[PDB]
Design a binder for these strands. Structure first.
Ligand SMILES: [Mg+2]
Ligand SMILES: [Mg+2]
Lengths: 152, 66, 252, 159
RNA sequence: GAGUACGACCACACUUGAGUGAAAACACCAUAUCCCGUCCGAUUUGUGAAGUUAAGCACUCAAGGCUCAGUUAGUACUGAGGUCAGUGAUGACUCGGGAACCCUGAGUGCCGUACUCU
RNA sequence: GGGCGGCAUAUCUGUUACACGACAACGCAGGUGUCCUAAGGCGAGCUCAGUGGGAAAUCUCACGUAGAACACAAGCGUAAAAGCUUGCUUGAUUAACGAUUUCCAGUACGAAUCGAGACUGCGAAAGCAAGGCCAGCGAUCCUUUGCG
RNA sequence: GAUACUUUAAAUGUGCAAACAAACCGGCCUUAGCCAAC
């Protein structure tokens, strides 16, 4: 009502973790970003140039543009009854490569390896069995489960 | 006199649903992108259009032959 | 008097980087040196690292990687005896020779040795380096000096001139060379050539012998009977030796 | 023991805390120059007014001036003058007493002498590259400064 | 098994106190006519090589810290339920999720590129 | 209730606020209509607040994870710096009607982010800089100046 | 702290992905794009 600025209420959001202050590192500088990659937008509070608005601090999107020091990202934002695609521009210090598709890529790679082996005629690995089946249980220790006087 | 509340708003917003975003492959304009790459891509696309016209002419001639 | 480094002092303490604690690397400068345009999607970029010890000089060509820097090629001033230089390592002339040796080895490895012959003639002149940032372009690298102070006449710039004359592209202005005059804003190629070939060494050596004639400096020269009026010729011969055999290193 | 532990005079410091901005401070600046042969440096309070003059002499000149001051001090001072971390000092009340011919244009000043002692190899704490801290065995104890006082410009601690 | 230069991760690597250090190197160290800079060759810059492991450094050894487990504990808290109990504060129960400090056990850097020595 | 008082009428920080975002009261505690040719830009050198031992406020040595400073309120951030001293400078200019964020009707205004071109500054170089990060401001019509 | 500010840290939440205009494996064409060059 009385005060609504660009960075209002970011006291705990734009702060560094305990005993982890400092500035970005050469690993961040040496990271390659292409158009079409998935990235996470995480604001780095020690840079302060090209920082995103607080709404975008935990979101994942697609890169649509690369400049000498900046990245353009598409991020979904629901407004009233629809979802908008917002284009934000940030410095490269404030993005990270996303691992949101690791499992899918791994599944495709394993499928290719299986196809190669099946065509080669190599023996396939033994398929895993279910853990919800029956069987005979041979016990080592049996006890008595009870509520005793000393318990209370 | 000046009341404020959000009481019925989510219910209103879900009657015709929250619509999903437009797919990535539609409305994929490049306006506002980094200029030098844009300028190069335009030249490549012009050459590609010329090649498409030539390929169609060759197909038509081949079909006429047989 | 309460102790400072008590229990609560250690819990809130953040250690600096390893090489910052050892006082070796200026990470603020390193970030600006390794930074590159993001639109150049990780194309190679090279540093010429120069480090001067007490008894040697080191010069290498380095490209940075996440796993760790890799060295394309390295040269040391301590192997110049195999080319014909002794008793006079770690000075300005040996710096020039070290730079030229590194450049020759690098072009020879990259297979462009015949092209970009460099400056077969030696002169302390200035010639702006040809760069795309402004015919096949010359191989390029940027200079890295570390924590060293960049005063006029310092040996890092002599190392730099060695490579520039060997035929490398290293962007630079002639404002920190020995012959430069700040007020007039011009360079004295005669003075720079004198320092390249080591006339000042000869002058000092003559002075010390003439003074010590009556009744520890330059002890190895005096012991080995090195005479003045040959230092310039010795350096000039070493340059040709390098340009003939760029890889002839110390024996065994 | 090892020759590398020979105690040496690192430096000598001369101070005049005039506390006044007028002509007396400038005359002190002149006499300091004529004494030490190196240009003194001014010192301002924390303000914006110069209130002190001082120097830092190193070498055989430092040794000579230290001996000269010790002549006036009669080679006798007080034990509490010595301080932990190895250093001491004193003062002179009549400047011409140090063999300086009196000039009427100036008067007399209360000079202060301080000394610094240490071994060789303390560069590792003032170096730019790989600056570190000296080990404690290599340091100098107050008792050791007292012991060096004897047999090198011998005098009386007069504790 | 070591050293140097550049490094990625940035305390299992830090702080304090001791002992050992083959050869190579790194370093203290000598010096001030020239390039260059200071009140001061201290720092820095140039040119050197007599001496020394005394310090820096590396390794090993004892305490605060740091890191990974265990206990604390199915405890504190919490999503869902009742025409549940209680004047009420609050509490237990039914279907699920599930900590932290303290205390205690273990250890005390690791991975690259280039060139060198025993 | 209205009057009196006040501004909760433009506008910022911490809380209210319930670990995405959003969220009210003449709710609470505080700020704003200015100031700066340097208190703007860049390169280099240096380390601060404070504590302990010495010397007829100042000089000296050790320690010192920021406990100081950054025009002004507050919160974040920063140590071979983003603080302090110093050298040179005017990027506080121009910028083909480029794109975007915040408010939001996804209108404008104010503020801000990523850019392309010109002319430049500082630096050996990589680089950095089109004000002082984030509050400090204004339609139609009319008047007036610059430009072709 | 004072005499509630905070290292740690839930439950309930919240963003993205999970093969038909997409992605994987090898020819070739074009660019007055990057790179010393390809
Ligand atoms: Mg521009
Ligand atoms: Mg009017």
């Amino acid at each position: 009502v009385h005060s609504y600025g660009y960075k209002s209420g970011t006291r705990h959001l734009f702060a560094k973790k305990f005993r982890k202050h400092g500035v970005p590192s050469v690993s961040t500088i040496l990271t390659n970003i292409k158009v079409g990659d998935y990235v996470d937008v995480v604001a780095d509070s020690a840079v302060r140039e090209g920082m995103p608005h607080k709404y975008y601090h935990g979101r994942t999107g697609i890169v649509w543009n690369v400049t000498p020091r900046g990245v353009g990202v598409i991020i979904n934002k629901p407004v009233r009854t629809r979802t908008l695609r917002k284009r934000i521009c940030v410095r490269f210090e404030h993005v990270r490569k996303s691992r949101c598709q690791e499992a899918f890529k791994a599944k495709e790679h394993q499928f290719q390896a299986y196809l190669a082996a099946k065509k080669a005629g190599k023996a396939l690995p033994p398929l895993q069995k279910s853990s919800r089946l029956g069987g005979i249980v041979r016990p080592k220790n049996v006890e008595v489960l009870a509520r005793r006087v000393a318990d209370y | 006199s000046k009341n404020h509340t959000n009481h019925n708003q989510s219910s209103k917003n879900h009657r015709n649903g929250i619509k999903g975003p437009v797919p990535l492959h539609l409305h994929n304009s490049k306006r506002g992108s980094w200029l030098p790459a844009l300028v190069n891509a335009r030249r490549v696309r012009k050459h590609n259009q010329k090649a498409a016209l030539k390929k169609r002419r060759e197909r038509i001639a081949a079909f006429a032959a047989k | 008097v309460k102790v400072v480094k008590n229990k609560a002092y250690f819990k809130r303490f953040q250690v600096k980087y390893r090489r910052r604690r050892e006082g070796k690397t200026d990470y603020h400068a390193r970030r600006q040196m390794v930074l590159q345009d993001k639109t150049k999607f990780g194309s190679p970029k090279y540093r010429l690292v120069v480090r001067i010890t007490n008894k040697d000089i080191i010069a290498q060509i380095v490209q940075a990687k996440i796993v760790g820097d890799e060295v394309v090629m390295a040269a040391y001033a301590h192997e110049l005896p195999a080319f014909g230089i002794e008793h006079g390592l770690t000075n300005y002339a040996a710096a020039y020779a070290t730079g030229l040796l590194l450049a020759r080895r690098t072009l020879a490895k990259l297979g462009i040795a015949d092209k970009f012959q460099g400056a077969k003639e030696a002169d302390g002149s200035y010639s702006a380096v040809r760069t795309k940032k402004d015919e096949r372009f010359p191989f390029k690298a940027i200079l890295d000096v570390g924590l060293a102070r960049t005063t006029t006449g310092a040996r890092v710039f002599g190392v730099l001139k060695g490579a520039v004359d060997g035929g490398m592209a290293v962007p630079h202005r002639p404002n920190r060379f020995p012959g430069y005059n700040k007020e007039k804003s011009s360079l004295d190629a005669k003075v720079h050539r004198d320092r390249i070939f080591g006339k000042h060494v000869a002058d000092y050596l003559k002075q010390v012998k003439e003074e010590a004639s009556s009744n520890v400096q330059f002890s190895k020269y005096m012991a080995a009977k090195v005479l003045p009026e040959s230092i310039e010729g010795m350096y000039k011969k070493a340059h040709a030796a390098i340009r003939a055999d760029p890889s002839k290193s110390l024996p065994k | 023991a090892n020759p590398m532990r020979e105690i040496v005079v690192k430096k000598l410091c001369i101070n005049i805390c005039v506390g006044e901005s007028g002509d007396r401070l400038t005359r002190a600046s002149k006499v300091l120059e004529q004494l030490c042969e190196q240009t003194p440096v001014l010192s301002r309070a924390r303000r914006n007014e110069k209130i002190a003059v001082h120097c830092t002499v190193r070498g055989k000149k430092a040794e000579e001036l230290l001996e000269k001051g010790l002549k006036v001090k009669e080679f006798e001072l007080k034990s509490y003058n010595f301080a932990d971390t190895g250093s001491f000092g004193f003062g002179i009340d009549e400047h011409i007493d140090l063999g300086i011919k009196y000039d009427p244009s100036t008067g007399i000043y209360g000079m202060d002498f301080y000394v610094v002692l240490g071994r060789r190899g303390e560069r590792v704490a003032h170096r730019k590259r790989k600056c570190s801290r000296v080990g404690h065995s290599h340091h100098v104890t107050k008792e050791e400064a007292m012991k060096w006082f004897e047999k090198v410009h011998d005098g009386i601690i007069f504790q």
